[PDB]
């Protein structure tokens, strides 16, 4: 390895640097000096080399050295004003970054007094006036909150949660998830969400067989999968109720909540009361529950064949609600009906089982146990409470096995998320010592 991408950067050969990027050379590879190409470019003041690496190369502007220094330190340290301009204009830049010795870019700049250090120092000082960049944090009702990014893309989940306008009690129920259409991951407090967004094609590559160009990740506020059901039952905060509710309704409508028709009807009636208020004879009597507004109160998996024969039982239970009142009281009742549902609060993973035929399955894990849904129909294939089964990862970490102590059925789920599943099973089981 000659490290030609690195050499091209400090030599300032733009055309060479650009071509090497297209020829699939990595922008975060560290050479034998533990330096990435952006470090050479910023140390030696190669303006155009840094610009191409940040833009075409889509390099992390805060990418650390082997010795934990940043491009901004090298840029400012060498007094390369124009490169400092560029880095500060990058949306992901962490302007509160510190090196291995807790020094700021300004500290190095003012000390070394190299080149255009005076100009670089001005840019750094009046960069404090700049408003921070903002990331969108979505809820399951489709809405979102713009949160200020203190440390650019180095901003952690915990720091983002502090940016959420949530009290200490409404906050303990939720955390940040990174989710595309067909992969959802709950992040830990120390994780950096925008790095996961950045590395999303590689995350999909490790865990799924999905097309990265057909999946687009976003950040979500979502129920903590670790939240004990016994703790949730004590909840009484209106905002915390609303968020859990909207997420519950979301799972309901998509068909992830499996239950007898009586339960699904009870839920539909509660949604009618919650959305439309009290029942009135002129409005909702006949022809009211058709395809269009049935779809917002019943599972989509029941909308075609099953729901059209529920309309009268739904109207009855809806009428009885009109003859609780407050909005968060009603939504709590909804959750009360959801809590007894087997797959409530579950994280879902995708996999396959092989009957020696090939059945694609959702793998659900919650504080209750493990659950398998047929991927197309969302039908509940198997539901196992903790204590009633055991799990074991496969040789390759590409599958896992489950042993039923009573049903004595053993089966193997094939999935590249097997590691995440086994890890999560262990954690949630341990909460029940």
From Swiss-Prot:
It is a peripheral membrane protein. Changing residue 165 to E: Impairs interaction with RAP1B. Disulfide bonds: none annotated. One of its GO terms (biological process) is angiogenesis. Residues 133-433 form the FERM domain. It is found in: Cytoplasm, Cytoskeleton; Cell membrane; Cell junction. The keyword Cytoplasm applies. GO terms for cellular component: cell-cell junction; cytoplasm; cytoskeleton; extracellular space; plasma membrane; protein-containing complex. ANK repeats lie at residues 1-29, 33-63, 67-96, 101-132. The keyword Membrane applies. Residues 143-165 are annotated as: Interaction with RAP1B. Low levels in brain. Very weak expression found in heart and muscle. GO terms for molecular function: GTPase regulator activity; microtubule binding; phosphatidylinositol-4,5-bisphosphate binding. Transmembrane segments: none annotated. Keywords: Angiogenesis, ANK repeat, Cell junction, Cell membrane, Cytoplasm, Cytoskeleton, Disease variant, Membrane, Repeat. It is linked to Cerebral cavernous malformations 1: A form of cerebral cavernous malformations, a congenital vascular anomaly of the central nervous system that can result in hemorrhagic stroke, seizures, recurrent headaches, and focal neurologic deficits. The lesions are characterized by grossly enlarged blood vessels consisting of a single layer of endothelium and without any intervening neural tissue, ranging in diameter from a few millimeters to several centimeters. CCM1 inheritance is autosomal dominant. The FERM domain mediates binding to RAP1A and RAP1B and is necessary for binding to phosphatidylinositol 4,5-bisphosphate (PIP2). Interacts with CDH5. Found in a complex, at least composed of ITGB1BP1, KRIT1 and RAP1A. Interacts (via C-terminus FERM domain) with RAP1A (active GTP-bound form preferentially); the interaction does not induce the opening conformation of KRIT1. Interacts (via FERM domain) with RAP1B. Interacts (via N-terminus NPXY motif) with ITGB1BP1; the interaction induces the opening conformation of KRIT1 and competes with ITGB1 for ITGB1BP1 interaction. Interacts with HEG1 and CCM2; greatly facilitates CCM2-binding to HEG1. Component of the CCM signaling pathway which is a crucial regulator of heart and vessel formation and integrity. Negative regulator of angiogenesis. Inhibits endothelial proliferation, apoptosis, migration, lumen formation and sprouting angiogenesis in primary endothelial cells. Promotes AKT phosphorylation in a NOTCH-dependent and independent manner, and inhibits ERK1/2 phosphorylation indirectly through activation of the DELTA-NOTCH cascade. This is Krev interaction trapped protein 1. It comes from Homo sapiens. The gene is KRIT1. The chain holds residues 288 to 730 of 736 of the full protein.
């Amino acid at each position: 390895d000659d490290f030609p991408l690195h050499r091209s950067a400090c030599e300032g050969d733009s055309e060479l640097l650009s071509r090497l990027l297209s020829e699939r050379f990595s922008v975060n590879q560290l050479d034998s000096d533990h330096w990435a190409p952006i470090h050479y470019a910023c140390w030696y003041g190669k303006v155009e080399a840094t610009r191409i690496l940040l833009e075409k190369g889509k390099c992390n502007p805060n990418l650390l050295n082997g010795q934990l220094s940043s491009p901004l330190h090298f840029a400012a340290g060498g007094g390369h004003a124009e490169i400092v301009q560029i880095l500060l204009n990058h949306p992901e830049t962490d302007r509160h970054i510190t090196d291995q010795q807790g020094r700021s870019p300004l500290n190095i700049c003012e000390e070394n007094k190299q080149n255009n250090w005076e100009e670089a120092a001005k840019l750094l000082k009046e960069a404090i006036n700049k408003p921070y960049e903002k990331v969108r944090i979505y809820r399951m009702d489709g809405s979102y909150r713009s949160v200020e990014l203190k440390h650019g893309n180095n901003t952690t989940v915990q720091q983002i949660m502090e940016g959420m306008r949530l009290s200490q009690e409404t906050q303990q129920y939720f955390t940040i998830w990174i989710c595309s259409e067909n992969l959802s991951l709950q992040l830990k407090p120390y994780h950096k969400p925008l790095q996961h967004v950045r590395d999303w094609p590689e995350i999909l590559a490790e865990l799924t067989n999905l097309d990265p160009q057909r999946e687009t990740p976003q950040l979500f506020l979502r129920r903590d999968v670790r939240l004990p059901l016994e703790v949730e039952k004590q909840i009484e905060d209106p905002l915390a109720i609303l968020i859990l509710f909207d997420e519950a309704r979301y799972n309901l409508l998509k068909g992830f909540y499996t239950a007898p028709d009586a339960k699904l009807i009870t839920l539909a009636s509660l949604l009618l009361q919650i959305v439309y208020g009290n029942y009135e004879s002129k409005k909702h009597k006949q022809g009211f529950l058709n395809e269009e507004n049935l779809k917002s109160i019943v599972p989509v998996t029941k909308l075609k064949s099953k729901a059209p024969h529920w309309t009268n039982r739904i109207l009855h239970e809806y009428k009885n609600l009109s003859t609780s009142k407050e909005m968060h009281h009603l939504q709590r009742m909804f959750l009360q009906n959801c809590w007894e549902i087997p797959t409530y609060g579950a994280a879902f993973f995708t996999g396959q089982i092989f009957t020696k035929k090939v059945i694609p399955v959702y793998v659900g894990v919650n504080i209750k146990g493990l659950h398998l849904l047929n991927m197309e129909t969302k039908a509940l294939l198997i539901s196992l409470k903790y204590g009633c089964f055991m799990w074991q990862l496969g040789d390759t970490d590409t599958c896992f096995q489950i042993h039923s102590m009573e049903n004595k059925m053993s089966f193997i789920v094939h999935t590249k998320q097997a590691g995440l599943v086994v890890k999560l099973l262990m954690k949630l089981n341990g909460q029940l010592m």
